[PDB]
Amino acid sequence: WTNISGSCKGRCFELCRCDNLCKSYTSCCHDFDELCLKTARGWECTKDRCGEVRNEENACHCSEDCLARGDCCTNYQVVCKGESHWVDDDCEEIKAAECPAGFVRPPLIIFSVDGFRASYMKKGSKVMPNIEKLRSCGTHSPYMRPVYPTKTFPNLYTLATGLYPESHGIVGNSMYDPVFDATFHLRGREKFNHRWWGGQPLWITATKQGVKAGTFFWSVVIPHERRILTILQWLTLPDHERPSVYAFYSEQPDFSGHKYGPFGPEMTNPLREIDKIVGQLMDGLKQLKLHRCVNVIFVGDHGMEDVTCDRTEFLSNYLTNVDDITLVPGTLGRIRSKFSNNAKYDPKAIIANLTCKKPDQHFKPYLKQHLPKRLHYANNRRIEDIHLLVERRWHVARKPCFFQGDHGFDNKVNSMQTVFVGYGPTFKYKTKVPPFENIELYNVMCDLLGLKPAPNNGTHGSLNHLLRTFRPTMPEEVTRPNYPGIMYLQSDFDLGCTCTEERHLLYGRPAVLYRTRYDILYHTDFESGYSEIFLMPLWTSYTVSKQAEVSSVPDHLTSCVRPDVRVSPSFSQNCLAYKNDKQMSYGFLFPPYLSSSPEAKYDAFLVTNMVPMYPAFKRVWNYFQRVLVKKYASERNGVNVISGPIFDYDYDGLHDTEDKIKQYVEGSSIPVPTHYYSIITSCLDFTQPADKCDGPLSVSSFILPHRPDNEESCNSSEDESKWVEELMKMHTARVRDIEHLTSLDFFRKTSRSYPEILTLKTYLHTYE
Ligand SMILES: *[C@@H]1O[C@H](CO)[C@@H](O[C@@H]2O[C@H](CO)[C@@H](O[C@@H]3O[C@H](CO[C@H]4O[C@H](CO[C@H]5O[C@H](CO)[C@@H](O)[C@H](O)[C@@H]5O)[C@@H](O)[C@H](O[C@H]5O[C@H](CO)[C@@H](O)[C@H](O)[C@@H]5O[C@H]5O[C@H](CO)[C@@H](O)[C@H](O)[C@@H]5O)[C@@H]4O)[C@@H](O)[C@H](O)[C@@H]3O)[C@H](O)[C@H]2NC(C)=O)[C@H](O)[C@H]1NC(C)=O
Ligand SMILES: CCc1nc2c(C)cc(N3CCN(CC(=O)N4CC(O)C4)CC3)cn2c1N(C)c1nc(-c2ccc(F)cc2)c(C#N)s1
Ligand SMILES: *[C@@H]1O[C@H](CO)[C@@H](O)[C@H](O)[C@H]1NC(C)=O
Ligand SMILES: [Ca+2]
Ligand SMILES: [Cl-]
Ligand SMILES: [Cl-]
Ligand SMILES: [Cl-]
Ligand SMILES: [Mg+2]
Ligand SMILES: [Zn+2]
Ligand SMILES: [Zn+2]
Secondary structure, eight states, rough: OOOOSSOOOOOOOOOOOTTTTTSSSSOOOOTTTEEEHHOOOOOOOOSSSTOOOTTBBBBSSSSSSSSHTTOOTTTHHHHSSSSOOOOHHHHHOOOOOOOOOTSOOOOOEEEEEOOOGGGGGGGHHHHHHHHHHHHHHHHESSSSEEOSSSSSHHHHHHHHHHHHHHHHSSSOEEEEEEETTTESSSSGGGGGGGGOSSSHHHHHHHHHHOOBOOOOOOOOOSSHHHHHHHHHHTSSSOTTTTTTTTEEEEEEEEHHHHHOOOOOOGGGGHHHHHHHHHHHHHHHHHHHTTTTTOEEEEEEEEOOOEOOOTTEGGGGTOOOOOOOOEEOOEEEHHHHHHHHTTTTOOOHHHHTTTTTTTTOSEEEEEGGSOOGGGGOOOOTTTTTTTEEOOOOEEEEEEEOOOOOEEEOSSSGOOOOHHHHHHHHBBBEEEEEOOOEGGGGGHHHHHHHTTOOOSSOOOOTTTTTGGGGGOOOOOOOSHHHHHHHHOOOGGGGOOOOOOOOHHHHHOSSOOOSSSSSSSSEEOOOOOOEEEETTEEEEEEEEEOTTOOOOOOOOGGGGGOOOOOOOOGGGGSSSHHHHHHHOSEEEESSSGGGGGGGSSHTTTTGGBBBEEEEHHHHHHHHHHHIIIIIIIHHHHHTTSSEEEEEEEEOTOOSSOOOGGGGGOOBSSSOOOOSSSEEEEEEEEEESSTSSSOOOOOOEEEEEEEEEEEESSSSSSSSSOGGGGGGHHHHHHHHHHHHHHHHHHHHOOOOSSSOOOHHHHHHOOOOOOOO
């Protein structure tokens, strides 16, 4: 209960209740609506109202005293004192923060916009003149990549925390938690309960370190114009109460985008309306002389794609009993049993029945651990085991148009990409930066406010090139390598088997960042870090020049496997284990096919180059190694390739210890990888060959799932040239994803600054 006879006079939107959540499922004071939500005579002055008698019933004021009180209309001195709009002024550089004396730091305003597709910036100064001036005058990128699923709640909270949805808990707009036995929905009281929201959002991080925060939630009752005036009012408060971080949120252009689709003619007016709101903010900041003091982030949560009811796949066309499953539908699918203790429910049968039933099926089923690792969408009990990736432009529903637009698809889809602009004293002047992921902004926003960020999934230092003015450190090597010479006789081995750095290790040896034991093994054509714990290489580095020749293996040397005299028999694999395992075969990390001579080819058959590989996966690996590596080398002027295994049985995106591994080669202690990776590097200046590179690097990487069939690839019955490249692209990855998965640290000795290397490690080759 609260005594609502108490007033909100002189405390509207305070930091009885008068806060932004008091209309949600609480209760405001009796005069909240009268005092705080005044809408009389609009949000703009006229020549008629200039120097008028002050009326407290007005929404904003044009009287002579309004400036000292800090509640002028945003255009007051434009209309009444003959000043120009902020937009009409010439672009002047801010070489330092021009804040009133008393300010301890420049303020940050985060202007978030729902469903702002990246291609909307193409409209230009005709439709959005304020946003366009912010973009051209400040720091900007072509786009910003959201997280998966590309929905509002997961992305806005990712922006707040720097965390993947699996880690912060908001894995969807809709979700079920089986420990709570409760459902989160866009509509309802449940979403306000704190138990759903993990991590530490920017506003808590700020408050804990002595920095006051504005509201990061506005009620839908409060109009957009009031929100701006509230922020401007808070900026005029005294030094003890004045916040340093502020947020604005708009539900446009999302709401319109759903109705009319991203390229509808009706989209123009919503964009005009948003820019009108941005113009009020900049004009109001100019009135306060804070227009060269505040840092402003214009950011979206995701894009928008053409979707209609005609393009709906129905699960009832694939499964028999759709009345026994619950489906979270639309631009993604999540399937679970409707009733617990249902013996008729079979997950394998559901996945089999959804797998490659038509030539042109517009979704694909996955167990969540088999999803592309770049999505980081497994490690949460709120994410269901069965997942459907839906093809762009389509929906999935259970069984059988108001809307023309939707989103939520795979976060590398062009139409899901969104927007970023940074403008102010701490952002650079007229600078263009490469695309980046929204997980990185938490760290930047902490830097901008002088805060120590909480542990997050950004790579602190990767966005230093956005700011005019944090120094990142390279991690400490935990285990030093051994460099074994010849230590064992050929006759010491009973494995049942029968029969450099300047060229092949260009960017230093990788640093092992966990406690283990491993050997560096040199060869003519390749180098490797051989693990005596996991009985295979952690990594294998080799360089293929532009004009390198692919030979083949002679018929008699097909099953050649040789003991390596530098490694003990008891820390080596054996062929007998592979003969006994009916389901498992083996492959090589450096391919025999790319040997520089017949003599060197014998090094590639060493037991220390061998790795366990299902026959179905060898179809993928042989095509990658024999055909594609030469093709990449030809096209990129040679390539350096680093390949190795990944073990992630608990699908948490992090390198497994020994106890997490659930699958070994039959009757052995040879662990089976869940995935295989490659990091393919060359010169960005493609006129220089990869081994003699002067400038910036170019990188692409993948994390291929190590699966005993090719059920993911619908054309796998065809030749590898019809389906393998398509599989690899789907599983593209940042080098940083591989570092988490292996506890390795790559690119430790280059000619580039460490900040530029962290940008390189966060790059995703999207193929879009
Ligand atoms: C992306 O970055 C993430 C952050 O660096 C990485 O996640 C982190 O991973 C490490 C290693 O696995 C975990 O470390 C273990 O922590 C155990 C204790 O965890 C519990 O306490 C934490 C308390 O934190 C305090 O400070 C934070 C701010 O820093 C405040 O927000 C807290 O309130 C508190 O004051 C807490 O962070 C953690 O939170 C999880 O659990 C709650 C509910 O129980 C969820 O609401 C929340 O979303 C977190 O869930 C996530 O992590 C758990 C595992 O902890 C998963 O099961 C779940 O599915 C979800 O992914 C928790 O309450 C400790 O016993 C161990 O010895 C380790 O030190 C961190 O817990 C974990 N933190 C977070 C926030 O995820 C992530 O690996 C990384 N990913 C990649 C691919 O690189
Ligand atoms: C889709 C719009 C929206 N609607 C709501 C509602 C109704 C509630 C809501 N809550 C209510 C519950 N609240 C609990 C809370 O205070 N904390 C959980 C942490 O421990 C701190 C978390 C957020 C966020 N909402 C949001 N979100 C996610 C918003 N995000 C932002 C946002 C976040 C980060 C930004 F950088 C910019 C804007 C807003 C603003 N301004 S509003
Ligand atoms: C799979 O499809 C077959 C053939 O249409 C059907 O008889 C069977 O019941 C389906 N299984 C499930 C679990 O839906
Ligand atoms: Ca793991
Ligand atoms: Cl300052
Ligand atoms: Cl080369
Ligand atoms: Cl570089
Ligand atoms: Mg076998
Ligand atoms: Zn949204
Ligand atoms: Zn939407």
